[PDB]
Design a protein around this ligand. Structure first.
Ligand code: ZN
Ligand code: ZN
Lengths: 137, 137
């Protein structure tokens, strides 16, 4: 049905992204529970339990079986409008839904900005060090 | 911003299809008016004022300046759900909107079916007349 860009708004889409997730039956942080919290699984060679809110884009690793994903999302990112959304998908008005997607688009830009900044700052330090060293010789 | 498949639900998208529409300021069937009624312009060399409901797919030609496009859509296609939609786009719930699109998908199939019927019937005549010409000898 829905365009790719929008699928992550659907719990079932999100749940389906957890394949090879280690915390199943018996655990607090099940794929159902991770997805109810907004998380999408997106693991790396390095961090294979990496999860991301689809809406605010915060990443969390180091999950333990007892972790309650809502309490964790709340702790890591209290700003996230998804956490205030009470209604189900189909109960939302298009006005509301379009508003939420505008905000997600902004959240995304923000993370891309803040990233480019940290990378730029780190480059600035390499360049600066290198010119200190040259002045020194 | 919205998938192509869905744009026609938007008045302004529909208005924008009227390219070379002859009934403008002064007329009852203005593009704004046609669009409010669900029509998209889709002319041919042959029928250059051809207009189609985006929702029930009824086609109407032979438009005159005093024609009110809602009264005409009502006359030509009394059972078109778009005509019951009182709410604006943004006021609809996704559940409602998904329901409406399911129905437009059915209306489309139905029209593709009824068209294929007419084509079959018109072929049936060519075959019939061709066989009569052969038997007569
Ligand atoms: Zn979030
Ligand atoms: Zn119609």
């Amino acid at each position: 049905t829905l365009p790719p860009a929008w699928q992550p708004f659907l719990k079932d889409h999100r749940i389906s992204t957890f394949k090879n997730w280690p915390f199943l039956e018996g655990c607090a942080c099940t794929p159902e529970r991770m997805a109810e919290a907004g998380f999408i699984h997106c693991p790396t060679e390095n961090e294979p339990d990496l999860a991301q809110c689809f809406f605010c884009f915060k990443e969390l690793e180091g999950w333990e079986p007892d972790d309650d994903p809502i309490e964790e999302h709340k702790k890591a990112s209290s700003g996230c409008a998804f956490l205030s959304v009470k209604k189900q998908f189909e109960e939302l008005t298009l006005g509301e839904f379009l508003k939420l997607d505008r905000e997600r688009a902004k959240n995304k830009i923000a993370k891309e900005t803040n990233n480019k900044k940290k990378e730029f700052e780190e480059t600035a330090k390499k360049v600066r060090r290198a010119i200190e060293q040259l002045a020194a010789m």
